[PDB]
Design a protein around this ligand. Structure first.
Ligand SMILES: Nc1ncnc2c1c(-c1cccc(OC[C@H]3CCCCO3)c1)cn2[C@H]1C[C@@H](CN2CCC2)C1
Length: 306
């Protein structure tokens, strides 16, 4: 077993000299993610703010090929609520994957910054009911798009939902790579790293992942939004969580949680996966209470939603 390189240097290939790196944004799958700038990569923009991923020096040849294969798959996505590919630098080392910049970073750190006693609070109130419903619809729209494309996320969490400059939330990294230093994972002997606190009971039991188990995870992201990204099942160990959820347990509603969001979570956490809503059903439920631009950009209102 060894992967074939599927990446074709085509219209997505960007000259290395067009990319300038500004600062580190943090380790992602394969390597470091940087904030940068890209010259003449989008028609009508002389310079575009970008996120740039490099592949680490410690990576095997197989990992370097897999990195580019992941970028090649992204060429097929055009959803406003999924972080997009902008270009690839495959000529020489280090290989670079250029993506749209999500200027407010991951949803987990963004939510934690809005806590009243947070040292990095930006002087704005925590999410309003309207803002939380908007986030829910955006995440659900991106997930509905991925489902239509036959992708099961398997790792949906606030840590990998991303926030743009205008506060739009989008689906970030849905790859299979699991960071060994991420406490959101549990090392299960002979099962690898598992995001147990975000997993559906059937996934914990049988190892099955479907769009219905992604809906369970979506309910947990709603819980992170309404708790300002508290750790789910705080006080319970990974083993205690596995038993609790498999037995039919689910998260307590955070203090003074809005009723509409509590209702959404409860739907996501039905024990029978067939009773959970679909991501298209989530967007349909929330569509009348969204920003006026939503139908112009959503997968839900697009001609592709068939
Ligand atoms: N766009 C971005 N803007 C601004 N900051 C971004 C991003 C991304 C990003 C977004 C989508 C896909 C993607 O890569 C997946 C595939 C893409 C194809 C090649 C192989 O990796 C990376 C990550 N970060 C930073 C790194 C930091 C990590 N901490 C740990 C918890 C949060 C968040």
């Amino acid at each position: 077993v060894f992967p074939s390189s599927v990446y074709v240097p085509d219209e997505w290939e960007v000259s290395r000299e067009k990319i300038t790196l500004l600062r580190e944004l943090g380790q992602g799958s394969f390597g470091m993610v940087y904030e940068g700038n890209a010259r003449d990569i989008i028609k009508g923009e002389a310079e575009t703010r970008v996120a740039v991923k490099t592949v680490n020096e410690s990576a095997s040849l197989r990992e370097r090929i897999e990195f580019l294969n992941e970028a090649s798959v992204m060429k097929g996505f055009t959803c406003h609520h999924v972080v997009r590919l902008l270009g690839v630098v495959s000529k020489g080392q280090p290989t670079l994957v250029v993506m749209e910049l999500m200027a407010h970073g991951d949803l987990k750190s963004y939510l934690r910054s809005l806590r009243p006693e947070a040292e990095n609070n930006p002087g704005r109130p925590p999410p309003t009911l309207q803002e939380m419903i908007q986030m829910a619809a955006e995440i659900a729209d991106g997930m509905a798009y991925l489902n239509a494309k036959k992708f099961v996320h398997r790792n949906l969490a606030a840590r990998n939902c991303m926030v743009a400059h205008d506060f739009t939330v989008k689906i970030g990294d849905f790859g299979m790579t699991r960071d060994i230093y991420e406490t959101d994972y549990y090392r299960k002997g002979g099962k690898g790293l598992l995001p147990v606190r975000w997993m559906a009971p059937e996934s914990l039991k049988d190892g099955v992942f479907t769009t219905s188990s992604d809906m369970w995870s979506f309910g947990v992201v709603l819980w992170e939004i309404t708790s300002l990204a508290e750790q789910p099942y705080q006080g319970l160990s990974n083993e205690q969580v596995l038993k609790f959820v498999m037995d039919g347990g689910y998260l307590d509603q955070p203090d003074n949680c809005p009723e509409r969001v509590t209702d959404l979570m409860r739907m996501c956490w039905q024990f029978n996966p067939k009773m959970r809503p679909t991501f298209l059903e989530i967007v349909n439920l929330l569509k009348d209470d969204l920003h006026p631009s939503f139908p112009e950009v959503s997968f839900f209102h697009s001609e592709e939603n068939k």
